[PDB]
């Protein structure tokens, strides 16, 4: 069977598309998003002229800060970014932009990237002892992002992240990183590089394509809901012989739809992974794109229109630390966990660290405690469970716990 | 750790290799027993399928050896009967490719693990 997702209603997918267009114009370093370009491009939407100068500013952030004089003329100090996770999704959109790779700042671009997959490689070891310092999701895309502009990676280089889903592996990857790896792998085989490991690559799909469907939940989410578009985006580029991808993609569909309804999908990274697929496209349709299939210009969304908010109170702990903290913060309803975070450190006793990412803030300190190497801050709220949001999307109701917790893994 | 079982036998004599896999995957996976031989070149033992239905033999074992797997413990066993001095060799658990006449993965492997020594002398 396939795996197919009938095409959504119009105003739903609009919706989602007018959550991106304020993105559209911050075009800062520390907001240029090339996953919101590529997810754009692939959708049936469109932002008309905006789209080609994001594209120009991605092409004047990524090659100015990562080549010669690796500052930014405009910007100025680009504080060791981007990283080479996002270079890849550069070059996914330079894709979506029907380019390739190329002149002499393209090529040094290349070999950066096949720097970083040789480094973890390293770090991997040739007895895959050893951990990637970054993740195999990134691993992974970096695989997919070269071979989609014709580079070629090093059997030895591919044998590490075969070696992550094949019998031997340790530890257990989560959806998103298993899809990427499928991703990857997808793209491999679709191009004939790496034929001296064509039969483990084919094994390594249909693991992966295994692996995924014993994902889903009751509710029908590969994994959980921001699991899903990239889950989908892996099962719709194979057939699955012997198995009812048909209506496991069926069950997806209508558990993307309730969450829809239900305002899951704010952010712009998750909308950017998902938009493709309810265009029928995914990151594999990136090897020969067509470019130019006509998209709805979308329009700005309503002004928001602010108004009365009553007081709540959150509970805020930290009892990873000797002496642990915990304290209730009165915020506006509405208010997200990083405004929670700004009222405890204004109260005192309370501090912080956030970096920028392509999901937004990321929370890398808590009261001075900074997380270290294969460790990092997990939020959570009552009874003991994991947000699946981060600390500017979660907005916590009167009388919750948010926890932060320092976690290894 | 995953090969184990190995050792120094007489003709005739008899032996159990255990291979156990870490990984989650396990049940997805035809799995084999390869052997390398002092001297000689990687070469597929025994292979069988993901659920144990369908199974494959190099001729030269074919009736002495015996492949089984217990995917609830995530491990595959290659019963190792009538030993011969030609059965001299390392061995070595990994995956298989099932294929309609299973078959060796050996030219796509460039990492094995430590394996099992077996040993069969006068």
């Known amino acids: 069977e396939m795996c197919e997702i009938p095409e959504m209603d119009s105003h739903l997918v609009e919706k989602l598309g007018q959550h991106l267009l304020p993105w559209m114009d911050r075009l800062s370093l520390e907001h240029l998003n090339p996953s919101i370009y590529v997810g754009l491009r692939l959708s049936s939407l469109q932002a008309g002229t905006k789209e080609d100068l994001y594209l120009h500013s991605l092409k004047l952030g990524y090659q100015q800060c990562l080549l010669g004089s690796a500052f930014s003329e405009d910007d100025g100090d680009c504080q060791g970014k981007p990283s080479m996770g996002q270079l890849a999704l550069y070059l996914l959109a330079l894709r979506a932009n029907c380019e390739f790779v190329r002149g002499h700042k393209g090529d040094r671009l290349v070999s950066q990237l096949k720097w970083f997959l040789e480094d973890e490689k390293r770090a991997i070891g040739h007895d895959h002892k050893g951990h990637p310092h970054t993740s195999y999701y990134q691993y992974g895309l970096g695989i997919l992002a070269l071979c989609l502009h014709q580079k070629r990676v090093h059997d030895s280089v591919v044998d590490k992240l075969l070696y992550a889903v094949e019998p031997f592996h340790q530890g257990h990857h989560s959806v998103d990183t298993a899809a990427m790896a499928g991703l990857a792998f997808t793209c491999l085989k679709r191009s004939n590089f790496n034929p001296g490991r064509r039969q483990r690559i084919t094994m390594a799909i249909r693991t992966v394509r295994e692996e995924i469907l014993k994902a889903q939940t009751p509710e029908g989410h590969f994994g959980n809901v921001y699991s899903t578009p990239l889950a989908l985006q892996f099962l719709m580029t194979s057939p699955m012989r012997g198995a009812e991808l048909g209506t496991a993609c069926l069950k997806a569909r209508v558990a993307l739809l309730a969450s829809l309804q239900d305002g899951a999908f704010q952010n712009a990274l998750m909308i950017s992974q998902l938009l493709p697929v309810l265009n029928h496209k995914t990151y594999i349709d990136l090897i020969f794109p067509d470019c130019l299939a006509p998209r709805v210009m979308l329009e700005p969304a309503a002004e928001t229109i602010p108004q009365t908010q009553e007081i709540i109170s959150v509970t805020l702990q930290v009892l990873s630390l000797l002496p642990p903290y915990r304290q209730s913060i009165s915020v506006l309803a509405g208010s997200t966990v990083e405004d929670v975070l700004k009222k405890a450190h204004e109260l005192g006793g309370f501090t912080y660290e956030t970096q920028a990412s392509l999901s937004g803030p990321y929370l890398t300190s808590v009261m001075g405690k900074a997380a270290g190497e294969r460790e990092f801050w997990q939020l959570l709220r009552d009874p003991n469970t994991p947000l699946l949001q981060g600390i500017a999307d979660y907005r916590p109701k009167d009388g919750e716990t948010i926890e932060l917790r320092l976690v290894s893994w | 750790l995953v090969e184990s079982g190995g050792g120094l036998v007489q003709p005739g004599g008899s032996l159990r290799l255990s291979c156990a896999a870490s990984?989650?995957?396990?049940?997805?996976?035809?799995m084999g027993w390869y052997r390398q031989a002092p001297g000689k070149e990687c070469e597929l033992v025994a292979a069988?399928?993901?659920?144990?239905?369908?199974?494959n033999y190099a001729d030269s074992v074919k009736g002495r050896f015996t492949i089984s797997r217990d995917n609830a413990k995530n491990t595959v066993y290659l019963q190792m009967n009538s030993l011969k001095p030609e059965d001299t060799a390392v061995y070595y658990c990994?995956?298989?490719?099932?294929?309609?006449?299973?078959?060796?993965?050996?030219?796509?492997?460039?990492?094995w693990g430590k394996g099992t020594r077996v040993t069969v002398s006068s």
């Open positions: 069988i399928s993901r659920a144990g239905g369908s199974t």
């Open positions: 990994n995956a298989a490719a099932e294929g309609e006449t299973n078959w060796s993965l050996c030219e796509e492997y460039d990492y």
């Open positions: 990984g989650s995957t396990f049940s997805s996976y035809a």
